[PDB]
Ligand binder design. Structure first.
Ligand code: HEM
Ligand code: GGJ
Length: 394
């Protein structure tokens, strides 16, 4: 006898398990067991993944309900699950969106300067360099301090919460609450700090004292700051890191993008499509009985939308494992989700990776792994797939 198929399949972010394609072909929605012991429906075809993400009866916010089957334990207060919904309800969506676009004056120049400085320091210190801890993550952290309008020197301490905050754990995590409460107190202080007048926290600080927002809670304002810094940093840092591995693994692509930098946006779009940075499917709770493929999903059941299921589906992306810069449907991947909860940071995330890669290829055109790829150490029971260190030479 055998037990029910368990998720996740593998913490390795450098290759997709052969199992995904077999599953997609034979059972593109099927029952699995999560690390909590709960049952869930795993959805792995492009067609069924988009169906679920485009049907609001598959609810994000209801995943936080007491007694629901769980993918993993909450690491935040249940209100945080619906942070974007609460932002919308408070009348803050347009202002938040505007604050996190990469189009702010001087932001792209800032990103370029920061990337080049990080890379110069690596070159000075001499190979091997760790491109995650000493390039991609610090670039993400610096970017988000700038976008939030908070001091650069505060970045590292906020960053160190994240190795716990974005755990994917069977059980509640005591350190997560300690760090969450501390970070909320920090952001509350930021809102009271008269020197904070730019970026997202600058704008929130202004709106907080505007009569049109006098009944928006200080808890929500602080929560937006902690949530957007943390989710933005973990998402951009982890994506850029695993995109760099994909690029290093492809010397011909690396050379083409070095030679023709104008192709980098199209390269980044394919790197997004093939990216394995999400460690778990996106969870949703059914709020009605809903037919998905051959399965009638029942009210109250957990559904997991497997992003690499959709994104490597050959029916939608022929030769899915290949980076092709001339696809006719290049942004139709699900790396930023789809529907009601489409990532509001998508433009910023694109620009972070484009500028990071452009700088790296200019400074280190000969970049290569300094260790056999199997020697990368993949973080386990985490919401992202990332190597603990990314040693390179050039
Ligand atoms: C390469 C970078 C990024 C990737 C791959 C990414 C990916 C995603 C995905 C897949 C979702 C949908 C989750 C779901 O439907 O369950 C999402 C939502 C979200 N993202 Fe991102 N993200 C990135 C960058 C950012 C940045 C830079 C920010 C903010 C500074 C951000 C903030 C958010 C927020 C607040 C949501 C929730 C939206 C909602 O519930 O309506 N993300 N992201
Ligand atoms: C800052 O630390 C956090 C840890 C977990 C969450 C969290 N727990 N459960 C849910 N639902 C969320 C959440 C809330 C808002 C946005 C995102 C999210 C999810 C995927 C990608 C990106 N960029 C953001 C996730 C939020 C913040």
């Amino acid at each position: 006898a055998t037990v029910l198929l368990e998720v996740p399949f593998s913490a390795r972010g450098d290759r997709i398990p052969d199992a995904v394609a077999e599953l997609r072909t034979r059972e593109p929605i099927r029952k699995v067991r999560t690390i909590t012991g709960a049952e869930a429906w795993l959805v792995s075809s492009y067609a069924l993944c988009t169906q679920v993400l485009e049907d609001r009866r598959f609810s994000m916010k209801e995943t936080a309900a007491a007694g629901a089957p769980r993918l993993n334990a909450l690491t935040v207060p249940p209100e945080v699950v619906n942070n974007m919904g609460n932002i919308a309800d408070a009348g803050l969506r347009k202002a938040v969106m505007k604050a996190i676009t990469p189009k702010a004056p001087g932001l792209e120049q800032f990103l370029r300067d920061t990337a080049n400085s990080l890379l110069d320091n690596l070159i000075t210190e001499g190979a091997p360099a760790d491109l995650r801890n000493d390039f991609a993550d610090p670039l993400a952290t610096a970017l988000h301090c700038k976008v939030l309008g908070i001091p650069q020197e505060d970045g590292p301490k906020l960053f160190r919460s994240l190795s716990i905050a974005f755990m994917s754990s069977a059980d509640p995590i005591p350190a997560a609450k300690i760090n969450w409460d501390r970070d909320i107190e920090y952001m509350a202080g930021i809102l009271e700090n008269p020197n904070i007048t730019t970026g997202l926290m600058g704008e929130l600080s202004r709106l907080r004292k505007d009569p049109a927002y006098s009944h928006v809670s200080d808890e929500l304002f602080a929560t937006i700051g902690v949530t957007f810094f943390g989710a933005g940093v973990i998402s951009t840092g982890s994506f850029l890191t695993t995109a760099l591995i994909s690029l290093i693994q492809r010397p011909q692509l690396r050379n083409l993008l070095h030679e023709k930098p104008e192709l980098i946006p199209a390269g980044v779009e394919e790197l997004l499509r093939i990216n394995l940075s999400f460690a778990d499917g996106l969870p949703r709770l059914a709020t009605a009985d809903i037919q998905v493929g051959d399965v009638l999903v029942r009210k109250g059941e957990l559904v997991l939308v497997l992003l690499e299921g959709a994104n490597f589906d050959p029916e939608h992306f022929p030769n899915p494992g290949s980076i092709e810069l001339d696809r006719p449907n290049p942004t139709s991947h699900l790396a930023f989700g789809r529907g009601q909860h489409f990532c509001p940071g998508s433009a910023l995330g694109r620009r972070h990776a484009q500028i990071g890669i452009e700088a790296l290829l200019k400074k280190m055109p000969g970049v290569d792994l300094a260790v056999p790829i199997d020697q990368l150490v993949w973080r386990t029971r985490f919401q992202r797939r990332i190597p603990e260190r990314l040693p390179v030479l050039w």
